[PDB]
């Protein structure tokens, strides 16, 4: 009678569950719904895009929570205009470490890499941005955020100061802060094999239907563009 799904996206070849979860390029596809989904990975491991400091956050259990939801679909449209966020003009950070069928460049769709234009050189002030609820009638807002941090000189090469950056988000009573890490980054893991002195810290926040999402950030943030709209409950096993 009923059917099952172990792979969150069939027809997404060579893509693990966390590959399609982060919105890795060449892993986006139709993610259908089945009331009885099977759990397979104790350690959801990625493969491809920019290396991740997985242990810094609770990011590893995004699909195992998403698999408990019946219907799943990524955001049809962007959540916020990244370039028009406060704190100066921003350039959509593309990258060659996350390739694409047309060109070797690309990046996550769930998150965009914000880079301040070279007009930026000033003592900064903390910033804030809300996160709307674009999702449908009952589908919960599963927003995926993060920030980038590189070596000491590369941060100063990209941003105004070599000093660490401060971030924090809050939604549905869950409030968490984050400070960036500089230098002596751990080994490259779950990447495409290309050397990168920078690292990525990924996390997510849940907004019940109508609940606004708050995001306070500094330089080096990975603002979300696409987000997950999931509702109901799917049987986990």
């Amino acid at each position, epitope marked *: 009678g009923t059917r099952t799904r172990g792979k969150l996206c069939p027809d997404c070849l060579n893509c693990t569950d966390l590959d399609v979860a982060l919105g890795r390029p060449m892993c986006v596809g139709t993610t259908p719904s089945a009331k009885a989904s099977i759990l397979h990975e104790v350690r959801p491991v990625t493969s491809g895009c920019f290396p991740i400091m997985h242990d810094r956050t609770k990011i590893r259990q995004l699909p195992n929570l998403l698999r408990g939801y019946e219907k799943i679909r990524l955001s049809t449209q962007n959540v916020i205009d990244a370039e028009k966020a406060p704190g100066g003009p921003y350039r959509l950070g*593309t990258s060659g470490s996350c390739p694409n069928a047309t060109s070797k460049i690309g990046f996550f769709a769930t998150m965009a890499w914000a880079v301040p234009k*070279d007009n930026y050189k000033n003592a900064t002030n903390p910033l804030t941005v809300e996160v709307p609820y674009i999702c449908t009638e009952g589908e919960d807002q599963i927003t995926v955020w993060g920030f980038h941090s590189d070596n000491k000189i*590369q941060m100063k090469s990209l941003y105004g100061d070599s000093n660490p950056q401060k971030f924090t988000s809050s939604a549905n009573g869950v409030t968490t802060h984050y400070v960036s890490q500089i230098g002596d980054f751990p080994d490259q893991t779950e990447d495409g094999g290309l050397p990168q002195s920078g690292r990525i810290v990924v996390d997510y926040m849940m907004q019940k239907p109508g609940k606004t999402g708050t995001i306070v950030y500094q330089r080096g943030v990975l603002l979300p563009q696409k987000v997950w709209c999931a509702s109901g409950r799917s049987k986990v096993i």
Partner: antibody
Amino acid sequence: EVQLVESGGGLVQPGRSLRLSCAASGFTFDDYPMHWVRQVPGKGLEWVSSINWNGGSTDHADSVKGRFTISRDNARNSLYLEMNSLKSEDTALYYCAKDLRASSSMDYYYYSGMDVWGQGTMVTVG
Amino acid sequence: DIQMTQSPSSLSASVGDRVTITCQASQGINNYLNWYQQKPGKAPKVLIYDASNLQTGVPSRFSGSGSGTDFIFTISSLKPEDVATYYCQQYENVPITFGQGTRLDIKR
């Protein structure tokens, strides 16, 4: 009028160091990566160094590895090339050129065709 | 490292003639190749970008081709205004390399 004007030409004795400059105008200078290309007068083309729109990814040729260095300022619409310990073979005409792709790549693969070249300035090595 | 080698190096052809220049790469490159025109004493200008895509603002008579290991350049009808030395250029990985260049001169 889209212009690329090289500057800082002349004479340098062997072993010296120079700081070449390039002025951009007529286009959004911040979106396109930049390249430097040399050419011995009446001879072929050799590539010098390329940089993305950002200062994040720098790439040098092995012939000038560790001796030359690229730098740019998009707030002033100017491109620089820092040269150290000039060899005798480095005597050539050097061109300033912009990339055609506007991809803000920040990664290894950002370089493409030029489509816009300056008139170039002569580097003489006593 | 990549290296480009162009075939004729010196081409003599009549007015209105179709000339062909090939540029084979040392290693394999997928469509990542461009072409440039350089008259002596003046700055070069691009003609064909990314294997046979003609640059906007250049005459329609020019054309390219190629994929994988062998790449082809083509001038359909020759005008005296086309005299120059031509170079193929790659934009795949590592330092961009040019061929040793091909010179072109006319024969009428």
